[PDB]
Enzyme design. Structure first.
Site, PDB file in Angstrom:
ATOM      1  N   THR A 191       2.477   8.673   8.585  1.00  0.00           N
ATOM      2  CA  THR A 191       1.287   9.166  10.169  1.00  0.00           C
ATOM      3  C   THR A 191       2.074  10.235  10.936  1.00  0.00           C
ATOM      4  O   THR A 191       3.295  10.194  11.222  1.00  0.00           O
ATOM      5  CB  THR A 191       0.515   8.310  10.613  1.00  0.00           C
ATOM      6  OG1 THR A 191       1.321   6.967  11.950  1.00  0.00           O
ATOM      7  CG2 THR A 191      -0.120   7.136   9.501  1.00  0.00           C
ATOM      8  N   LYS A 246      -2.964  -6.184   4.468  1.00  0.00           N
ATOM      9  CA  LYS A 246      -4.192  -6.361   4.861  1.00  0.00           C
ATOM     10  C   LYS A 246      -5.422  -7.678   4.624  1.00  0.00           C
ATOM     11  O   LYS A 246      -6.279  -7.149   4.833  1.00  0.00           O
ATOM     12  CB  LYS A 246      -4.306  -5.902   3.313  1.00  0.00           C
ATOM     13  CG  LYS A 246      -3.283  -4.500   2.995  1.00  0.00           C
ATOM     14  CD  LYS A 246      -3.725  -3.092   4.009  1.00  0.00           C
ATOM     15  CE  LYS A 246      -2.604  -1.700   3.839  1.00  0.00           C
ATOM     16  NZ  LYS A 246      -2.516  -1.326   5.425  1.00  0.00           N
ATOM     17  N   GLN A 287       0.607  -1.209   0.166  1.00  0.00           N
ATOM     18  CA  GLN A 287       0.235  -0.188   0.270  1.00  0.00           C
ATOM     19  C   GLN A 287       0.344   1.089   0.066  1.00  0.00           C
ATOM     20  O   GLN A 287       0.217   2.134   0.049  1.00  0.00           O
ATOM     21  CB  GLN A 287      -0.735  -0.288   1.430  1.00  0.00           C
ATOM     22  CG  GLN A 287      -0.702   0.278   2.945  1.00  0.00           C
ATOM     23  CD  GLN A 287       0.094  -1.277   3.213  1.00  0.00           C
ATOM     24  OE1 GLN A 287       0.688  -1.827   2.474  1.00  0.00           O
ATOM     25  NE2 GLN A 287       0.495  -1.049   4.309  1.00  0.00           N
ATOM     26  N   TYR A 288       2.131   0.873  -0.146  1.00  0.00           N
ATOM     27  CA  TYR A 288       3.083   2.105  -0.057  1.00  0.00           C
ATOM     28  C   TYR A 288       3.680   2.300  -1.974  1.00  0.00           C
ATOM     29  O   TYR A 288       4.620   3.427  -1.939  1.00  0.00           O
ATOM     30  CB  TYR A 288       4.163   2.142   0.797  1.00  0.00           C
ATOM     31  CG  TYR A 288       3.703   2.179   2.610  1.00  0.00           C
ATOM     32  CD1 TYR A 288       2.593   2.902   2.634  1.00  0.00           C
ATOM     33  CD2 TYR A 288       4.545   1.224   3.321  1.00  0.00           C
ATOM     34  CE1 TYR A 288       2.076   3.144   4.177  1.00  0.00           C
ATOM     35  CE2 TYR A 288       4.168   1.302   4.685  1.00  0.00           C
ATOM     36  CZ  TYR A 288       3.334   2.030   4.697  1.00  0.00           C
ATOM     37  OH  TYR A 288       2.172   2.207   6.255  1.00  0.00           O
ATOM     38  N   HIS A 292      -6.847   8.209  -1.582  1.00  0.00           N
ATOM     39  CA  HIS A 292      -5.769   9.545  -1.652  1.00  0.00           C
ATOM     40  C   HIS A 292      -4.956   9.179  -1.936  1.00  0.00           C
ATOM     41  O   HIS A 292      -4.750   7.328  -2.423  1.00  0.00           O
ATOM     42  CB  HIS A 292      -5.716   9.719  -0.321  1.00  0.00           C
ATOM     43  CG  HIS A 292      -5.040   8.745   0.809  1.00  0.00           C
ATOM     44  ND1 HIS A 292      -3.741   8.491   1.104  1.00  0.00           N
ATOM     45  CD2 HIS A 292      -5.598   7.841   1.998  1.00  0.00           C
ATOM     46  CE1 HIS A 292      -3.359   7.695   1.945  1.00  0.00           C
ATOM     47  NE2 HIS A 292      -4.398   7.739   2.457  1.00  0.00           N
ATOM     48  N   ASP A 341     -15.139   4.992   5.638  1.00  0.00           N
ATOM     49  CA  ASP A 341     -14.238   4.065   6.676  1.00  0.00           C
ATOM     50  C   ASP A 341     -14.297   3.847   7.790  1.00  0.00           C
ATOM     51  O   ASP A 341     -15.423   4.281   8.830  1.00  0.00           O
ATOM     52  CB  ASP A 341     -13.433   5.832   6.729  1.00  0.00           C
ATOM     53  CG  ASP A 341     -12.405   6.216   8.165  1.00  0.00           C
ATOM     54  OD1 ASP A 341     -11.242   4.899   7.603  1.00  0.00           O
ATOM     55  OD2 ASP A 341     -12.404   6.857   9.443  1.00  0.00           O
ATOM     56  N   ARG A 366       1.830  10.387   0.788  1.00  0.00           N
ATOM     57  CA  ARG A 366       1.802  11.023   1.687  1.00  0.00           C
ATOM     58  C   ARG A 366       2.963  10.820   2.543  1.00  0.00           C
ATOM     59  O   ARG A 366       3.926   9.798   2.222  1.00  0.00           O
ATOM     60  CB  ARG A 366       0.224  10.611   2.438  1.00  0.00           C
ATOM     61  CG  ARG A 366       0.944   8.762   2.860  1.00  0.00           C
ATOM     62  CD  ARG A 366      -0.589   8.567   3.903  1.00  0.00           C
ATOM     63  NE  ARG A 366      -0.987   7.633   4.829  1.00  0.00           N
ATOM     64  CZ  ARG A 366       0.458   6.649   6.116  1.00  0.00           C
ATOM     65  NH1 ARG A 366       1.531   7.401   5.971  1.00  0.00           N
ATOM     66  NH2 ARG A 366       0.101   5.559   6.065  1.00  0.00           N
ATOM     67  N   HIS A 392     -10.115   5.004   1.650  1.00  0.00           N
ATOM     68  CA  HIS A 392      -8.840   4.704   2.759  1.00  0.00           C
ATOM     69  C   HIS A 392      -8.681   3.519   2.006  1.00  0.00           C
ATOM     70  O   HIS A 392      -9.046   2.689   1.492  1.00  0.00           O
ATOM     71  CB  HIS A 392      -8.331   4.888   3.781  1.00  0.00           C
ATOM     72  CG  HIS A 392      -8.481   5.907   5.069  1.00  0.00           C
ATOM     73  ND1 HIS A 392      -7.434   6.354   4.278  1.00  0.00           N
ATOM     74  CD2 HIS A 392      -9.856   7.185   5.335  1.00  0.00           C
ATOM     75  CE1 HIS A 392      -8.006   8.310   5.277  1.00  0.00           C
ATOM     76  NE2 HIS A 392      -9.653   8.544   5.759  1.00  0.00           N
ATOM     77  N   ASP A 393      -7.141   3.223   1.629  1.00  0.00           N
ATOM     78  CA  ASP A 393      -6.683   1.580   1.746  1.00  0.00           C
ATOM     79  C   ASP A 393      -7.278   0.207   2.453  1.00  0.00           C
ATOM     80  O   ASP A 393      -7.368  -0.426   1.799  1.00  0.00           O
ATOM     81  CB  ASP A 393      -5.050   1.323   1.733  1.00  0.00           C
ATOM     82  CG  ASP A 393      -4.321   1.572   2.938  1.00  0.00           C
ATOM     83  OD1 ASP A 393      -5.666   1.867   4.070  1.00  0.00           O
ATOM     84  OD2 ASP A 393      -3.742   1.074   3.715  1.00  0.00           O
TER      85      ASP A 393
END
Ligand SMILES: *[C@@H]1O[C@H](CO)[C@@H](O)[C@H](O)[C@H]1NC(C)=O
Ligand SMILES: *[C@@H]1O[C@H](CO)[C@@H](O)[C@H](O)[C@H]1NC(C)=O
Ligand SMILES: *[C@@H]1O[C@H](CO)[C@@H](O)[C@H](O)[C@H]1NC(C)=O
Ligand SMILES: *[C@@H]1O[C@H](CO)[C@@H](O)[C@H](O)[C@H]1NC(C)=O
Ligand SMILES: *[C@@H]1O[C@H](CO)[C@@H](O)[C@H](O)[C@H]1NC(C)=O
Ligand SMILES: *[C@H]1O[C@H](CO)[C@@H](O)[C@H](O)[C@H]1NC(C)=O
Length: 435
Positions: free
Chosen positions: A58, A270, A20-21, A52, A180, A55, A330-331
């Protein structure tokens, strides 16, 4: 490196292996027929579900990474071989927000959506919602910029009114948000994903730890620290240049084989966190599935999971006849939604001890399914070949054949047949187990 049509194509032996990155890369024709609109077919509705963009870490992860880099620089008496850069590396990554590269991915995604669905988009202003996260809203705004840019360049467009984000759905343990996860109490307490991830990390990290410590005399690492250093390869790459055109120096610390293991760690997290590996994972996607059913069938939403009854019952916040819909999420929610829709019903439960490729997993991996800037298109089309409307699902440009219905060679089912096949979501699944 990143283009509208193909997504991110630089250094694929590394950058497509960040789960997911990973920046979105097009899976057009990958273990799939073409995603092109079939001959004598016309799109009648399209739903987009977009993550999205790329990024920063976090706030909590950024604190953890900076702590590690500082400790390495405080403790190492030498920085050998490819670890040499760590003597002078200065940690300057932000937190939570989109990077410039992530903003541009979303502009590109809006351009691509316009171009792909130009026939409808010429006259349609899409109905748009976003989950209430700043990076998700910002991604929606950037997608709209790209959509409008493409529409302005098309002399055939007749309605150029800018779409707004009409609904921003709050992110709260007590707000029913289909974009979400958060209200399913038992699911939110689940440790399964983290436990599977920790177990797999314990298998592959020790050898890497030993090698890193050899090149950093004086430093003591944990298995977790190895994963942090590997995370830094993606985060630094998508931050350090505006176009992500230069692989981070963290990336070459690890071999291609090690990147395949990291990619699988992400897929496991995931699958066991949000997908069918989690007993309540696919339940998190039921609300959106029922919203999609309502849109496909132009009928009121029937759902008692994570839809909000006030929002779905008002045409201002949930129109049933908008022809184009775009939702930003979101993922993790996207994984649950894809599993709730049955799209990965050909995927066997992932081995917790052995790396299985996306091929062996019938097209499932975190990088193939929820990369940064991930998008899914759910189409209805009217084809000369068939009286009934046909449905098709495209995930990052890959045709993902529908399950639960009489699917054709192009991955499609008749609309009513598809909806009938979603009996689990239509019933509310095992949502009661939440409480
Ligand atoms: C549903 O949406 C309404 C209108 O925004 C909001 O006031 C209410 O708190 C929401 N309820 C739940 C449980 O999501
Ligand atoms: C992690 O490994 C332990 C010990 O090998 C095992 O008993 C446990 O069930 C594993 N946990 C998961 C979630 O796979
Ligand atoms: C650095 O040294 C301190 C003090 O002994 C130790 O507690 C810490 O774990 C070390 N960190 C690293 C990453 O080497
Ligand atoms: C939110 O969903 C829960 C069940 O998950 C339900 O108790 C509640 O009434 C819903 N609220 C709204 C406004 O949809
Ligand atoms: C996907 O498989 C799950 C588990 O067998 C099942 O509950 C669900 O109904 C299937 N969905 C579809 C759309 O066929
Ligand atoms: C279609 O009808 C809906 C009610 O379902 C209403 O909001 C609106 O008039 C139409 N949708 C638009 C303009 O997108």
């Amino acid at each position: 490196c990143d283009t509208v049509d193909l997504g991110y194509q630089c250094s694929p032996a590394t950058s497509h292996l960040w789960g997911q990155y990973s920046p979105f890369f097009s899976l057009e024709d990958e273990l799939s027929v073409s995603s092109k609109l079939p001959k004598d077919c016309r799109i009648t509705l399209v739903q987009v579900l977009s993550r999205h963009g790329a990024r920063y870490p976090t706030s909590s992860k950024s604190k953890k990474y900076k702590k590690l880099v500082t400790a390495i620089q405080a403790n190492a008496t030498d920085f050998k071989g490819k670890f040499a850069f760590l003597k002078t590396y200065n940690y300057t990554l932000g937190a939570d927000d989109l990077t410039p590269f992530g903003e541009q991915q979303l502009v590109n995604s809006g351009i691509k959506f316009y171009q792909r669905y130009k026939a409808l988009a010429r006259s349609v202003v899409p109905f748009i919602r976003a989950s209430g996260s700043d990076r998700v809203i910002a991604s929606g705004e950037k997608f709209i910029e790209g959509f409008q840019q493409a529409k302005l360049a098309d002399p055939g467009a007749t309605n150029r009114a800018a779409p707004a984000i009409s609904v921003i759905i709050p992110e709260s343990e007590t707000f029913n948000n289909t974009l979400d996860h958060g209200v399913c109490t038992k699911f939110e307490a689940s440790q399964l994903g983290d436990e599977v991830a920790a177990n797999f990390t314990a298998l592959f990290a020790p050898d890497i730890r030993a090698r890193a410590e050899k090149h950093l005399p004086g430093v003591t690492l944990t298995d977790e620290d190895v994963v942090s250093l590997m995370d830094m390869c993606s985060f630094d790459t998508v931050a350090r240049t505006s176009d992500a055109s230069q692989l981070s120096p963290f990336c070459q610390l690890f071999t291609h084989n090690e990147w395949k293991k990291y990619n699988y760690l992400q897929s496991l997290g995931k699958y066991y966190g949000y997908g069918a590996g989690n007993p309540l994972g696919p339940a998190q996607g039921i609300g959106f599935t029922n919203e999609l059913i309502a849109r496909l069938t132009r009928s009121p939403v029937q759902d008692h999971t994570s839809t909000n009854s006030t929002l779905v019952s008002n045409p201002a916040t949930f129109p049933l006849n908008a022809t184009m819909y775009v939702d930003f999420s979101h993922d993790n929610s996207m994984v649950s939604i894809f599993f709730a829709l049955g799209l990965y019903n050909g995927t066997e439960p992932l081995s917790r001890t052995s790396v299985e490729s996306a091929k062996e997993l019938d097209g499932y991996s975190a990088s193939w399914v929820v990369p940064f800037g991930a998008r899914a298109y759910f189409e209805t089309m009217q084809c000369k070949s068939e009286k009934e409307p046909l449905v098709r699902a495209l995930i990052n440009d890959r045709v993902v054949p529908l399950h639960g219905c009489d699917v054709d060679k192009l991955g499609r089912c008749k609309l009513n047949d598809f909806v009938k096949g979603l009996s689990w979501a239509r019933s509310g699944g095992n949502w009661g187990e939440c409480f």
